[PDB]
Design a protein around this ligand. Structure first.
Ligand SMILES: CCCCCCCCCCCCCCCCCC(=O)OC[C@H](COP(=O)(O)OCCN)OC(=O)CCCCCCCCCCCCCCCCC
Ligand SMILES: CCCCCCCCCCCCCCCCCC(=O)OC[C@H](COP(=O)(O)OCCN)OC(=O)CCCCCCCCCCCCCCCCC
Ligand code: SF4
Ligand code: SF4
Ligand code: SF4
Lengths: 161, 176, 53, 152, 112, 317, 49
């Protein structure tokens, strides 16, 4: 489900070997995508989790909204999910005339959609009863196991790369 | 920096316990919570009615293959052997021969439609601008013996439209 | 990513989660029910093919 | 006659009015099927309800990628399905295996295990060329069981 | 005399539709591979049914709470009566006699 | 023409369980922002007559490692008591005038769990062997949550017949003087008849619903069928008990019109709950019966004993 | 009083589009029943609205 988050850690691992930095516009594209796949990997982890538990709608309530955002891959790279876009020298090609009147219309109206899950799940009682004090691994055996982030910092140790 | 979430004690006085004991016992949550947030059914449903309506796409879309040709025909390919050297999946299979007129062309040209991983690496390696990922997802044949493509499928499949393709490339060659 | 010096690379070892996040389930699961176990796994956000690390 | 061959204008219509798909979501073509159950190109209520149990399903949909360690667990599940069963493979890895066609640990094609009806090509097919895939499967049902007992 | 022909209709319509599904349209003499399959979506279960203590006490506890609701059952018939100080103070006894049987067992239930 | 009345009640209700499966998903669809069955109907309305014939064509296998006389006897007792319970029920006139028939509901609602104990045993192993044993265990515990607060209104009704249950509510709509009992009346039938928040019978991610898990669409076609016959019958039983309508002898036509409109509304709630709430994780399911549901039910029981006495308001019988 | 406040628009929309025959002829393929605003020209008789 991470599309541009992978190839961000391959291109950056080959630029080091080449002694080449990417140019300045090629860095503010990678962040606008590398921080828009973090609104896709976190839609899935908070919905399919809550479908295994058994809540039906926030799966459907978010994927109906999610299809406004697989639109944005197609307009820039060419394709639906797996885009071969990032290269070891920056972005392949330029994004079309647009996408700044269409990300802006989108991203000014996403904080209401995330204001629905707060009322579905957080102050809900049954889901709080399904999830409190469950799977408490918190020790320095929760770092001896070599964990990366969350299931770290969500339990104690503040650190991220 | 920081932010602390779910780090707050209850008030634990005489007033706000009745505010919480009205919650557990007489359900001021769970009806105001989700007897109202759900219904909210009164929006218009967003369903693409598929055999008639179809969904939006973009002029750089990837799909069925094609081989263009010039104004009055020349079979734009020149068998220069690059679209086969950067297929990552080794789908293309070209075998040229000096054609009798003197200009070199293909004899056999084979694209599997199953090993085709749909890069866009054939589309951009070509110097003479021939092989183009054409914008039609119409597929779904019933035999594995069929999805192997020859040369003389692709031309037929590449001259069923060129009003479709040449409207796309003229819009998008200015970036690449 | 060990590179030898020519166009084709040498070994390319991937590190991904699922090695850490799922070796530490056997510690995490003991004591609780069976219907707690399906509640555990969703929070690690396990995506397979990435356990191909 | 006109009496018997009229009856397969109902049974071969009842068999194509509600398919119940099992799916094998294994790899990336799982997610691009889940958007079809998402209400944009809404899969259900165009005839075909979604995922069920292996005892009750008509038409299974293979996706993803079949390795060696899933090859017996497929064929076992294919056995339990009833007599009017159909197999659709989506994805370009259940057609001859995408890439990983040349690596050691892949069953090279998924037709080598089961007989599969409609092949749908594309790394992930866009849930748009999959409704066109199943609307090819309903057009396949023009067969009759009448004029078989009534001919021979 | 219809009570008793109010249900023997309902059961002979019930057993009708099951044999026109289990029998008739069925008879699977063709290939019908009944091999080692059909094992309820699994394999061979060489273990038998093991005892589970926390799922036995749920059976007995219900049975002893089920009896004295039948003592408690003729309370609406115990309304149109004679002497009613007796009728009230005895009706309150059984409920408390049911309530104490909670509180003793309530100090040890287990993961039920 | 008594025999023509019985068939006039079994047949028009098999449509109302077949035309509920269609409204099962249209109502559950507009909550997801999507249309109903769009293409086959025209509006959907012809879906279940096509979706019924497919089941009786598709091959009804029996499992090889199964028993014989038990596996094909539980669907006999499934539709038996699912349809026999519709008899003593006034609308406005019942088919049968039982002297005491409110108790006969529990005489019919008790034996339904004795088929689940069969079918979980009769076929096969662990996905319905132990996985159905803990489905009998939840359904037995919600009678003592049920039978008490069913008795807790009869101290105010007066007797056991159902004609008095419409007479006593000519001016009240009795949900008001007993609204704490009316809450736990709902959740009991929401969990006894094996529905969406307290599930493990049908099965979400539990016994992968191992109480059906094995029936191919021959015998399976009733289980679902029969089961959907309980859920519109506790709704027709709640609305004759709490939310009672008005009866006029000169006009019995206007009874049923104002009556079937009400049982349909409560039937919507079993659909409207499922699209909100997650499951209960079998411990917390039974952890709230004893500890939490039950001691209040005795508390109001002792309340409804004394209050007809210390009001001097004894109901007449 | 929205039972006639907005049905008045739908009365000309439902009924007066092709009479009695032209309405149910498009209803039997799907619930695509709304008459579109504009027309296409191409090609055969299939006016892509
Ligand atoms: C697999 C197929 C083979 C099996 C097929 C047979 C299956 C039958 C299963 C049906 C089980 C239903 C048994 C329910 C018994 C309760 C009947 C009852 O109590 O009726 C109420 C009524 C009480 O009398 P009352 O209300 O005072 O009448 C008014 C007078 N003014 O009472 C009356 O109105 C009349 C009482 C006498 C009526 C005849 C006796 C009723 C029972 C006859 C069937 C015997 C039970 C069979 C064994 C049951 C097995 C489950
Ligand atoms: C002095 C004069 C006399 C005084 C009279 C006073 C009258 C007072 C009446 C009070 C008694 C009636 C209320 C019934 C009690 C409520 C049931 C209950 O106790 O639930 C407790 C349950 C336990 O969980 P909790 O304690 O909150 O701990 C977890 C917190 N993390 O926590 C819960 O909240 C669980 C909630 C219910 C669980 C099921 C939810 C599933 C959805 C059900 C929706 C039902 C909606 C309404 C039903 C239909 C109504 C018509
Ligand atoms: S399209 Fe280009 S790369 Fe492909 S065969 Fe022709 S000349 Fe060679
Ligand atoms: S799309 Fe990519 S993999 Fe497929 S034929 Fe073209 S270059 Fe080869
Ligand atoms: S090759 Fe196609 S089917 Fe295989 S994982 Fe990738 S997208 Fe999915």
């Amino acid at each position: 489900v991470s599309m541009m988050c992978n190839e961000q850690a391959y291109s950056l691992a080959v630029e080091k070997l080449l002694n080449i930095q990417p140019p300045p516009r090629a860095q503010w594209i990678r962040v606008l995508f590398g921080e828009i796949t973090r609104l896709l990997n976190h839609i899935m982890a908070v919905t399919t989790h809550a479908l295994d538990i058994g809540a039906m709608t926030p799966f459907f309530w978010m994927f109906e909204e999610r299809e406004k955002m697989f639109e944005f891959y197609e307009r820039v790279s060419g394709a639906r999910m797996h885009a071969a876009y990032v290269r070891p020298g920056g972005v392949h090609q330029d994004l079309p005339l647009g996408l700044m009147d269409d990300i802006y219309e989108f991203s000014k109206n996403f904080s209401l959609r995330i204001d629905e899950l707060e009322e579905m799940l957080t102050n809900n009682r049954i889901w709080r009863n399904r999830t409190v004090d469950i799977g408490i691994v918190t020790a320095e055996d929760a770092l001896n196991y070599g964990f990366s982030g969350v299931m770290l910092r969500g339990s104690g140790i503040q650190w991220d790369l | 920096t920081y932010k602390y979430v779910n780090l707050r004690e209850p008030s634990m006085d005489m007033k706000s316990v009745t505010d919480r004991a009205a919650q557990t016992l007489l359900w001021t949550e769970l009806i105001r919570g989700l007897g109202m947030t759900l219904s909210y059914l009164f929006r218009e449903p967003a369903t693409i009615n598929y055999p008639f309506e179809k969904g939006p796409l973009s002029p750089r879309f990837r799909g069925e293959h094609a081989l263009r040709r010039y104004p009055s025909g020349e079979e734009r390919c020149i068998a220069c052997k690059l679209c086969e050297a950067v297929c990552p999946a080794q789908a293309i299979t070209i075998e040229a021969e000096p054609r009798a007129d003197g200009s070199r062309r293909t004899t056999r040209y084979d694209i599997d439609m199953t090993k085709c991983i749909y890069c866009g690496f054939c589309q951009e390696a070509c110097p003479v601008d021939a092989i183009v990922e054409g914008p039609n997802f119409e597929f779904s044949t019933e035999t594995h013996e069929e999805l192997l493509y020859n040369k003389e499928k692709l031309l037929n499949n590449g001259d069923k439209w060129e009003a479709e393709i040449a409207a796309n490339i003229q819009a998008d060659y200015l970036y690449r | 990513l060990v590179s030898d010096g020519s166009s084709r690379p040498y070994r390319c070892k991937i590190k991904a989660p699922g090695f850490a996040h799922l070796a530490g389930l056997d510690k995490m699961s003991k004591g609780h029910m069976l219907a707690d176990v399906v509640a555990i796994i969703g929070t690690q956000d396990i995506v397979f093919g990435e356990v191909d690390r | 006659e006109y009496v018997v061959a009229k009856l397969d204008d109902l049974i071969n219509w009842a068999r194509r009015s509600s398919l119940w798909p099992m799916t094998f979501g294994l790899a990336c073509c799982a997610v691009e099927m889940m958007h079809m159950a998402a209400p944009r190109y809404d899969m259900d209520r165009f005839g075909v309800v979604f995922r069920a149990s292996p005892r009750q399903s008509d038409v299974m949909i293979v996706a993803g990628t079949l390795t060696n360690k899933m090859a017996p667990a497929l064929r076992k599940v294919y056995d339990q399905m009833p007599e009017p069963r159909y197999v659709v493979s989506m994805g370009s890895c259940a057609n001859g295996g995408g890439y990983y066609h040349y690596s050691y640990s892949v069953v090279r094609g998924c037709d080598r295990i089961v007989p599969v009806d409609i092949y749908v090509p594309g790394c992930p097919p866009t849930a748009e060329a999959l409704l066109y895939g199943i609307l090819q499967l309903q057009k396949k049902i023009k067969r009759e069981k009448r004029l078989r007992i009534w001919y021979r | 005399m219809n009570l008793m022909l109010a249900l023997l209709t309902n059961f002979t319509l019930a057993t009708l539709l099951v044999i026109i599904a289990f029998w008739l349209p069925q008879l699977n003499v063709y290939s019908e591979k009944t091999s080692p399959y059909e094992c309820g979506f699994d394999p061979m279960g060489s273990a038998r049914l093991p005892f589970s203590m926390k799922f036995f006490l749920v059976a007995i506890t219900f049975l002893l709470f089920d009896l004295e609701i039948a003592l408690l059952l003729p309370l609406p018939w115990a309304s149109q009566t004679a002497n009613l100080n007796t009728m009230l103070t005895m009706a309150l006894f059984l409920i408390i006699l049911l309530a104490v049987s909670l509180a003793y067992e309530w100090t040890q239930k287990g993961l039920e | 023409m008594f025999m023509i009345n019985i068939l006039m009640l079994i047949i028009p209700i098999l449509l109302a369980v077949a035309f509920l499966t269609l409204v099962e998903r249209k109502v559950l669809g507009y909550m997801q922002l999507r249309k109903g069955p769009n293409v086959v109907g025209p509006y959907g309305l012809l879906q279940p007559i096509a979706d019924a014939i497919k089941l009786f064509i598709k091959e009804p296998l029996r499992p090889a490692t199964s028993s014989a006389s038990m596996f094909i006897l539980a669907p006999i007792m499934a539709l038996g008591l699912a349809l026999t319970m519709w008899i003593p029920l006034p609308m406005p006139y019942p088919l049968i005038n039982m002297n005491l028939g409110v108790l006969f509901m529990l005489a019919m609602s008790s034996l339904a769990v004795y088929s689940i104990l069969w079918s979980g045993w009769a076929s096969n192993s662990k996905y319905a062997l132990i996985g159905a044993l803990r489905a009998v265990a939840q359904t037995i515990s919600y009678e003592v949550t049920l039978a008490i607060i069913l008795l807790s209104v009869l101290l105010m009704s007066g007797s056991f017949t159902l004609s008095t249950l419409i007479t006593t509510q000519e001016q009240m709509w009795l949900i008001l003087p007993a609204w704490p009992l009316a809450m736990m009346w709902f959740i009991s039938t929401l969990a006894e008849t094996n529905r969406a928040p307290f599930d493990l019978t049908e099965g979400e991610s539990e016994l992968v619903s191992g109480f059906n898990v094995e029936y191919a669409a021959g015998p399976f076609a009733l289980f679902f069928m029969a089961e959907y016959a309980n859920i519109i019958m506790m709704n027709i039983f709640t609305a004759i008990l709490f939310l009672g309508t008005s009866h006029n002898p000169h006009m019995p036509e206007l009874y049923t019109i104002n009556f079937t409109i009400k049982s349909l509304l409560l039937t919507m709630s079993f659909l409207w709950i499922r699209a909100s709430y997650p499951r209960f994780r079998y411990d917390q399911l039974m952890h709230l019966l004893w500890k939490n549901f039950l001691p209040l039910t005795l508390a109001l029981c002792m309340w409804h004993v004394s209050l007809p006495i210390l009001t001097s308001g004894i109901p007449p019988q | 009083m929205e039972l006639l406040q907005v049905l008045k628009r739908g009365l000309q929309q439902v009924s007066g589009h092709g009479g009695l025959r032209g309405y149910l002829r498009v209803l039997f393929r799907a619930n695509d029943v709304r008459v579109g605003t504009l027309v296409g020209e191409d090609k055969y008789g299939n006016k892509y609205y």
